[PDB]
Copies of this chain bind each other. A is one copy, B any other.
């Protein structure tokens, strides 16, 4: 709740260029968990390398979608239960596409990584903790989709 400001202020920097920042998050994600790459299947084809995904307009569009859902979480940072229904169904989608629930922890690490690299000295441990708890709440809501 004091850290709701910490979320708000830190997100301001990154929301100004969501694709550039989102591309950091996804490049980091594939570096940590390369087995996620085949799950982005567009026009019946699999990306061979992570740099392949960055040439795909559909993949970059998904980066934008991801950033908009995080942006919705920031907007509702003070009460995330308003998004529970939407997030539950987003979890069910991703379950359908083949994402394991556990892969969302790597996503969280990739989000925290992108924030640390963007904010530098401004990524205080209280900012880390706040984002950890906001992201934790998002994934909690999403996890409902897996049962």
Interface residues in chain A, defined as those with a beta carbon under 8 Å from any beta carbon in chain B:
19-21, 23-24, 27-28, 31-35, 37-39, 43-52, 54-55, 60, 98, 100, 102, 105-106, 109, 112-114, 116-118, 123-125, 128
Residues of B within 8 A of A47 (CB): 48
Residues of B within 8 A of A24 (CB): 51, 54-55
Chain B minimum-CB-distance residue to A52: B48
**Number of identical monomers bound together in the oligomeric complex:** 6
Chain B minimum-CB-distance residue to A46: B113
Residues of B within 8 A of A21 (CB): 55
Pick 27 A–B contacts, CB within 8 A, sort by A: A21-B55, A24-B54, A24-B55, A27-B27, A27-B50, A27-B54, A28-B51, A31-B51, A32-B35, A35-B106, A35-B109, A38-B109, A38-B113, A39-B109, A43-B125, A44-B124, A44-B128, A45-B116, A46-B112, A47-B48, A48-B51, A48-B52, A48-B113, A55-B114, A55-B117, A100-B102, A100-B105
